[PDB]
From a paper:
Members of glycosyltransferase family 75 (GT75) not only reversibly catalyze the autoglycosylation of a conserved arginine residue with specific NDP-sugars but also exhibit NDP-pyranose mutase activity that reversibly converts specific NDP-pyranose to NDP-furanose. MtdL from deep sea–derived Marinactinospora thermotolerans SCSIO 00652 has been discovered in the antibiotic A201A biosynthetic pathway, generating GDP-L-galactofuranose (L-Galf) from GDP-L-galactopyranose (L-Galp). The characteristic DXD motif (Asp109-Asp110-Asp111), together with conserved His287, coordinates a Mn2+ ion, which stabilizes the diphosphate of the nucleotide.
To obtain the Mn2+·GDP-L-Fucp complex structure, we initially soaked the crystal of MtdL containing 0.5 mM MnCl2 with 5 mM GDP-L-Fucp. However, no electron density of the L-Fucp moiety was observed, possibly due to enzymatic catalysis toward GDP-L-Fucp. The complex structure of MtdL-S228A·Mn2+·GDP-L-Fucp at 2.2-Å resolution was obtained by soaking the crystal of MtdL-S228A containing 0.5 mM MnCl2 with 5 mM GDP-L-Fucp and 0.5 mM MnCl2. The electron density for Mn2+ and the L-Fucp moiety could be seen in this structure. Asp260 hydrogen bonds to the L-Fucp C2-OH, C3-OH, and C4-OH, simultaneously. Besides, the L-Fucp C2-OH hydrogen bonds to the side chains of Arg159 and Gln229. Arg159 is located closer than Arg257 to the anomeric carbon with a distance of 3.9 and 4.3 Å, respectively, in the GDP-L-Fucp complex structure. We noted that L-Fucp C4-OH is positioned at a hydrogen bond distance (3.1 Å) with the carboxyl group of Asp260 in the MtdL·Mn2+·GDP-L-Fucp complex structure, whereas the D-Glcp C4-OH is positioned with a distance of 3.8 Å to the carboxyl group of Asp260 in the MtdL·Mn2+·GDP-D-Glcp complex structure.
Numbering used by the authors:
A (entry chain A), B (entry chain A), C (entry chain B), D (entry chain B): 4 to 374
Amino acid sequence: RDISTAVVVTTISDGGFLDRLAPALRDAGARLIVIPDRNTGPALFAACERHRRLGLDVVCPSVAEQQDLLERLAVPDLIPYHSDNRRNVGYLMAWMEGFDVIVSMDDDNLPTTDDFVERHQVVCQGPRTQPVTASSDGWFNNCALLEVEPTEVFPRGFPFHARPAHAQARTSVCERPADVRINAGLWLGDPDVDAITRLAVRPNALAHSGGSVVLAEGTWCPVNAQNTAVHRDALPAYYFLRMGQPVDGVPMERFGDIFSGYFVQVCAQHLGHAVRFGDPVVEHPRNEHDLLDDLHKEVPAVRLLDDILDHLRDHPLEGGDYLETYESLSYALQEIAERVNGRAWSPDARAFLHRSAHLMRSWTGALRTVA
Amino acid sequence: RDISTAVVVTTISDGGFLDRLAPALRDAGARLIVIPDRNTGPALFAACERHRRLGLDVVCPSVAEQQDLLERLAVPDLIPYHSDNRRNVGYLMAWMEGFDVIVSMDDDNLPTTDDFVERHQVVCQGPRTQPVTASSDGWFNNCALLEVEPTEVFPRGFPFHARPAHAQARTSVCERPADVRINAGLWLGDPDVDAITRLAVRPNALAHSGGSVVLAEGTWCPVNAQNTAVHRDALPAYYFLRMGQPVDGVPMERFGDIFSGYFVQVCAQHLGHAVRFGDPVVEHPRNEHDLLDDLHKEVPAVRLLDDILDHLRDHPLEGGDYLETYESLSYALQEIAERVNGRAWSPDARAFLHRSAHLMRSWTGALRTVA
Amino acid sequence: RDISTAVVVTTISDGGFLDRLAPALRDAGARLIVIPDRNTGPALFAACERHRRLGLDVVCPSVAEQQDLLERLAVPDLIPYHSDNRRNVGYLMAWMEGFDVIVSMDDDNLPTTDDFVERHQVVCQGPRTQPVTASSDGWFNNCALLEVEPTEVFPRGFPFHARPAHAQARTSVCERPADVRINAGLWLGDPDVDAITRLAVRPNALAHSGGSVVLAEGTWCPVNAQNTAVHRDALPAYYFLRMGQPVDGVPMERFGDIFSGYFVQVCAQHLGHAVRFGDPVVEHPRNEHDLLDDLHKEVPAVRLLDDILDHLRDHPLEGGDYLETYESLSYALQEIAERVNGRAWSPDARAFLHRSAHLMRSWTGALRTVA
Amino acid sequence: RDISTAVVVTTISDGGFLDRLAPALRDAGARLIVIPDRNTGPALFAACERHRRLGLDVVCPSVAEQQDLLERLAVPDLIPYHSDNRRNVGYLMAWMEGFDVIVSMDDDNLPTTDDFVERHQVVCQGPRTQPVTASSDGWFNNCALLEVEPTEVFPRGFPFHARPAHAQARTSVCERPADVRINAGLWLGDPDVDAITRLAVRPNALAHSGGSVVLAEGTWCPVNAQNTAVHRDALPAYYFLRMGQPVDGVPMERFGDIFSGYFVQVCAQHLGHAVRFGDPVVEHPRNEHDLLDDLHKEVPAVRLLDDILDHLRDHPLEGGDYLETYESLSYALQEIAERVNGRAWSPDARAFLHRSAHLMRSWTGALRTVA
Ligand SMILES: C[C@@H]1O[C@H](OP(=O)(O)OP(=O)(O)OC[C@H]2O[C@@H](n3cnc4c(=O)[nH]c(N)nc43)[C@H](O)[C@@H]2O)[C@@H](O)[C@H](O)[C@@H]1O
Ligand SMILES: C[C@@H]1O[C@H](OP(=O)(O)OP(=O)(O)OC[C@H]2O[C@@H](n3cnc4c(=O)[nH]c(N)nc43)[C@H](O)[C@@H]2O)[C@@H](O)[C@H](O)[C@@H]1O
Ligand SMILES: C[C@@H]1O[C@H](OP(=O)(O)OP(=O)(O)OC[C@H]2O[C@@H](n3cnc4c(=O)[nH]c(N)nc43)[C@H](O)[C@@H]2O)[C@@H](O)[C@H](O)[C@@H]1O
Ligand SMILES: C[C@@H]1O[C@H](OP(=O)(O)OP(=O)(O)OC[C@H]2O[C@@H](n3cnc4c(=O)[nH]c(N)nc43)[C@H](O)[C@@H]2O)[C@@H](O)[C@H](O)[C@@H]1O
Ligand SMILES: [Mn+2]
Ligand SMILES: [Mn+2]
Ligand SMILES: [Mn+2]
Ligand SMILES: [Mn+2]
């Protein structure tokens, strides 16, 4: 059977990134779902049509076409505008059309090898006994698989409480049954670190030297949405969380895929599935960012992430598939919002988990409508 | 059958208010459930024991006894301390002990007649054809039943959008079947107005001249918790909402009973029940308050109340009893939080309804545990 | 003896208000300085030219002409756009051109009599023995000069702490030397009350029945900028204060003329000058406003006004003219910002008085440049 | 020639740090001024008396003695409690008593050599031709004088915009006249980096390998208050800035010595004086800190520091001594607060520079009172 792959990219650029992204996608026959926004210029639509007649199966639904679909599914207020949260439209469209693989990318992640789509098809491998990687502290640093200067770094969304003692953790590999459903490809150039790390050492990923790994049950690593393949069964749990909720009056941002990466990861391991890190590797000539503005956006989420990850360890989930498990996860987040203690847990911070949980069940309700 | 009545009062005073509250409660054999807090002095416990040996069936469970009960019901974080929200403990205790009538009062509401408890027993009257009062605009002003100087006023929690045109509304009385389950007694001296009205005209309620009324379906009026009797069947919907959630960064307060008054009211009319206003009347020598501080607390809730009340009109509910209806109301509030539009509906304002809905279902879950 | 009058109005309307404002100004030969903004449509410029051809000495400098003037005076950042603070440009222009009387008005205040300009010329009367009105509590309610329904009201900016006991205050009139330099004309229709009063009673001013008064030293009343004449000597202290400073994170608005009215009033009394209230009376068909939004804007300033007014009584001022006295007042506000105590005096609230003081001295610095 | 040295430390510890701090201070006959706070336990007072009997000239004035002193100098509200800002009391006391050298330290900075006081006496050296260090980019990284693992770091308060291109900057040493008035000793163990750096790489200072340098005019480096000697002439410009002012609603902290270090540095260079970095080196077993809480406190100041430093380059100062120059700097900060542009410059951020400027002049006013 032929594996179908759909690449999802939301962007506000002029479409010039298609010149380097299309070749690997066009040669493999994969579909590219470009999600524009209201603040997206008309040059993107002209760039999609130019690459469409070059052989690329690219679609670029206008904001009017996106809103009509979301209104038919009784979720007109779920996905906001002027935000990269609109990539959920691409997730939904690729899921309705029955694609096997959904590859989430940004407009500044460019494949480096011809087998980019083939490597991401590993999420359709199925269960089989394979070498699995476990860590004594329950955390794995995927940036250790890369050659990074000037010093060692951690990925964005990695819990800070476990960073100092992670160097003494024991990494072991064992032959165990595993079912890879999420494949987080690595990145060269500017690695996916938080604004804290980028402001401190300005890391530069030189090469991919560690190969690929599959994480065992209990070993976690943050998964982003800039070079990540998700099997269609696991896609219901890959909802990009809506940002903007204030923490002590400071609205959070840039962590929509940090939560989605951990949410689909804890849902996968509950269902006997695993997350893979490594190939395919992409180039990340990162778009220009105000690093102090990125820091101001991420800190509200960083202040809560360690506590959320700690409570998720002690909260067992229920469900037979990803829809039931993700909805069970949403109820667990509401229980965590009331038991967690900390100086950063103001009433607006606790209410952030409650509104997020409602939006998660609103996302699953839309998927159950098309199904 | 003898009707059982339990009066619930949470306070941080020294207990001197018992000298005028006990006579009407003691002569009727009603129980008084005083709910202290961590910021409550020991003089209250000595005042309860002094009145207990005078004939009053008064109980004053310590914060250790309250927390033990709430922990046994799997709700240790539901009711916060240093807040008048602890009156929910009195609601829960009176409901577990099987009291027919639950009368919510404050420590500055003093009965004026000997039949205070007997008048509040009207919530056990049952269904019968009685004169019911309807208004063309769907709103009733209970302060019009009082002689107020220097001008006409509206009760606290009355929607502001309907105040200017309420004078032209048509009030009609018709003989219809009604089942009174909530009785909001009126107040003399300082009436229950919002800080806007109290700062503007400083109203003084002189006498109760309008008698008593029972409101028909579609006619609403805010119900407070300072002189209100609730039948035990309707008590599950009388949960005092938790305050402190910020609206555009400003934490709301003083509207815990505004929401509970409207919530139990919309739940009652869905179940074919009605709300009564009038006797018994109490004196309100209001405690000393910083009126500008009261205003700063109420404004965050005032900015949202009109929109919430508008959407509740167009949202039909489900349920066979008050537990099912209140839980259905909690889900309706979450749908309203995403459809409502307005300048005051910041992400923290929308998340206020989501966390409140979770706390409402957490309150119903505790009632289902003892049941 | 040849008195010149310039009227200052800043607006974002289409200029239709000129149809009822021009006749009284055109017959008296007074100049109208209309200050447009960036959010002002082009119809206002066409309305000014249409009325200019009818005989009205009206000027309407574009935002480019305003910014060039403010840049030549080394104050390019003093006056913001998208704000009614731009009336300070009109204050500055009328002062540079040597006008004797500067009448501050809004686009919804319309004269009711033909002698509108002549009555406002009372600020050029000079010192003389005249009936002077004093109050035992130090406050005068100018709304008592009007017939107001449905109840008695207080003007916007009146201290709330002195309202309840003001009815017991003794009002006496004596023949004393006085020099009227500020004349606050009254308003029919919608009186100038705060949002607290307008939301509570919705006042309607029927007629001007109390005549005119001149307040003694030690008797204060807030002076707005919608129908107020200021002598050119007192104009340097009439700087419309810049709004937007947060108080506990809540930005203040609608009180720029409340401070300017009190500031020019305490400066005038220090120099032996007085404030007049009464004629000329204008009609105020108030523009449409979101009253709950007006409340949310005014509360931050209302929380601090009573304390600021109390300290201005204890603080003696220095200076020989309005420029020196206004600067001395600016330093006094900085001393008050550190000695005042209260729950509403967060660090941002105290810093509001410091930035306001610098902007006051920046306004006087620009006036010293043209002089 | 008979040089007096007073060490200033404010602390809430139990006084155990005196065991390792007294020997170097006691052998040199220097005075130790310990400034307790309201949240300081009584064990500190017992530790000071225990070390006083051992020969250490240590004083520990109670909060009542501090407040009496600050009240006599007409500055009772300048220095808040429950804050390390109370070291300004120690700065004031050491200045009133005529000490030549004022060494600012914290309770976790411990001398490593016997000549600790003698090395800090370099601020009494006077003008002479000496090796002076200049940098092409105008910045010097004093952490480059240390052996730091695992990677190169920048000191706390170093501008982030100049960090990437600083490696390409040219460092030259020339024989020029210089007058050292501030000597910033270095620190082993935990270096003085911001929370961004400490969270990212967790630096560890191994040894002092770069020697000592004296910076030229136009070469800046942040100066902290944990191991810094200031000549008594330069002490008036060393006022520890008061924290707590919100930036976009987020109160700043931990940067009181970042401003004081830059302020005393720009004042010294205007007067022909210089700043020295190097010996004496102290050990810094840093007190336990919540690093994410340190980050949440520092970000508000980090968002504004690069812009403030850029404008201080363009702003010329006036004055003959440090008092006149510091006051001239205070007025310069007010001009900068209105001309600076950026996303982080909300009204509360601009007003922070205005209230800080008034507090700077309030500090100089108290110094002019004792003089
Ligand atoms: C931002 C976070 O870090 C990393 O990206 P990081 O290089 O920082 O961020 P960028 O790669 O610059 O931006 C991520 C994507 O968001 C798109 N985008 C930006 N603004 C908008 C907008 O207003 N609307 C829409 N529809 N799209 C928008 C942008 O074109 C790009 O495809 C990644 O791991 C993830 O993007 C993650 O969420
Ligand atoms: C406040 C609102 O307006 C009206 O009251 P309004 O006279 O303003 O307010 P009060 O009658 O002064 O206070 C209401 C009740 O709250 C209690 N209370 C106050 N502070 C605390 C505290 O920290 N803990 C606890 N456990 N109790 C507290 C107080 O003793 C009294 O019984 C009424 O309609 C309702 O109380 C409504 O919620
Ligand atoms: C507003 C306060 O209450 C009372 O007025 P109140 O009827 O509420 O307010 P209005 O009369 O509706 O508005 C006051 C004036 O502000 C102008 N204005 C409104 N928005 C803008 C804007 O963005 N830019 C500029 N340049 N002008 C603006 C408006 O056209 C009118 O001339 C009075 O006492 C005083 O105006 C006082 O300041
Ligand atoms: C804190 C900043 O970073 C670096 O220190 P950093 O190790 O972080 O901070 P610490 O050395 O832990 O604390 C600095 C000093 O503040 C004192 N302190 C802490 N809390 C209080 C309090 O509530 N009141 C008073 N009076 N003192 C207090 C503490 O005992 C110690 O002497 C240095 O460069 C500077 O201290 C700088 O200001
Ligand atoms: Mn990117
Ligand atoms: Mn009360
Ligand atoms: Mn108006
Ligand atoms: Mn330290």
